[PDB]
């Protein structure tokens, strides 16, 4: 009761106080608009107008001009104007152009895009280490590479060799590499960007690369950082049609990424996580073996590993008092944690069907039967017998 009362005390005074102070201040600001303010705001409206077209700043030409590229097909040679200068701008930033007569009249976007929103995240990851529990040895390759130079780059300097640089998560589906990427980045204490490489594919021209470029700019501000480009396999090498194409932009995007690996300065402070199904789902043209460092090879859980994984799942599962963990493990042979996840859910479905609260051991066998069903192999006793 009293633990409530104390929190109640603090939280009421801080919130309430603030509301009254905000409420008064909106009036105290607006009443005087004399002198500097009125003049400033007025000029800014006049130079501007309505509507304002989004633009992008490709480059600055050193004579108070710039080259800009519009969302309309044309591109344009414009003057730099207003309160926003070329010192205050930087290339690759989204800028406000006045519709009628193209000139930079301002900025309010400041390099905010619908791709920029998805990439952003400066908060800690959701999973912490061994949520993600187990593939411990796999973590004991990712952590080496990813956690350790950020934490102390010192170690490598005393060792006398270049730091690690990136990691390639590759190998078996269903081992959770898409989850694992999260687990590590929490432990280190760093900022975690996440972007899906499918959204760097565009049917518009020059847009593909702009989206790749935004990532490393952001990464450098919030350094140390771990950047997860989820599914570099999905840029892949694929083709939509070959009679109207779609397979040009794929290359230009892939290329823009290979360059900023090394080319965003030789640092292990701009780490990358590339998750891929296999390497031969990527463009075969590649950067050299040390530039990406260690390639992390996921393989099937062994007998011990899938006890761990199974155990995690079933704790969450309610009303299973007739299930014993070991016996599940005996009947099954080696399989992903993916299929354990499914078996546990299929076992709730069966027991819900029957209308019985309990979940049996017997129940689980029926679920094994369903998952294993179309994996059957009779050429096993074709060789053996």
């Amino acid at each position: 009761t009293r633990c409530k009362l104390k929190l109640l005390r603090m939280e009421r005074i801080k919130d309430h106080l603030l509301l009254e102070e905000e409420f008064v201040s909106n009036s105290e600001i607006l009443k005087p608009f004399e002198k500097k303010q009125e003049e400033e705001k007025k000029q800014l409206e006049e130079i501007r107008g309505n509507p304002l077209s989004i633009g992008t700043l490709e480059e600055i030409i050193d004579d108070d001009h710039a080259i800009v590229t519009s969302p309309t097909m044309p591109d344009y040679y414009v003057s730099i104007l207003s309160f926003v200068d070329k010192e205050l701008l930087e290339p690759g930033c989204s800028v406000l152009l006045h519709h009628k007569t193209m000139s930079i009249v301002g900025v309010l976007q400041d390099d905010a895009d619908p791709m920029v929103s998805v990439m952003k995240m400066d908060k800690s990851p959701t999973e912490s280490y061994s949520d993600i529990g187990g593939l411990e040895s796999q973590i004991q390759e990712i952590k080496e590479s990813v956690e350790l130079p950020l934490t102390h780059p010192e170690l490598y300097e005393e060792m006398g060799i270049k730091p690690p640089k990136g990691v390639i998560l590759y190998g078996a589906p269903g081992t959770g590499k898409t989850l694992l990427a999260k687990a590590v980045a929490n432990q280190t204490s760093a900022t975690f960007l996440r972007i899906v490489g499918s959204e760097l594919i565009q049917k518009y021209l020059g847009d593909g690369p702009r989206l790749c470029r935004q990532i490393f700019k952001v990464a450098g501000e919030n350094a140390p950082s771990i950047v997860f480009i989820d599914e570099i396999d999905a840029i892949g090498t694929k083709r939509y049609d070959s009679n109207s194409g779609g397979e040009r932009e794929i290359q230009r995007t892939m290329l823009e990424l290979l360059n900023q690996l090394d080319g965003f300065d030789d640092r292990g402070d701009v780490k990358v996580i590339m998750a891929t199904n296999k390497i031969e789902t990527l463009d075969p043209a590649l950067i050299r073996p040390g530039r990406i460092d260690r390639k992390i090879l996921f393989e099937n859980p062994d007998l011990s590993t899938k006890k761990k994984i199974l155990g995690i799942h079933t704790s969450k599962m309610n009303l299973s008092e007739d299930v014993n963990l070991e016996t599940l493990v005996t009947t099954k042979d080696d399989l992903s944690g993916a299929d354990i996840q499914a078996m546990c859910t299929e076992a709730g479905l069966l027991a819900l069907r029957e209308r019985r609260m309990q979940v049996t051991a017997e129940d689980f066998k029926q679920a094994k039967e369903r998952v294993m069903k179309n994996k059957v192999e009779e050429n096993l006793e074709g060789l053996y017998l």
Binding site: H16, L19, E39, L44
Partner: protein, 53 residues
Amino acid sequence: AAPYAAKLKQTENDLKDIEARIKEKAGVKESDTGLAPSHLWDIMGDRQRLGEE
């Protein structure tokens, strides 16, 4: 259920205040892009615009 329910009513006032602040704030929208030395820029800028290039 006295020990939490009495005092819960008091917290609901606190949640309501957390609702009130966000809207109270959002009512006031103003710019300026750049700083004071770039307010000079516009007086010039008017001219360089009326000229065509």
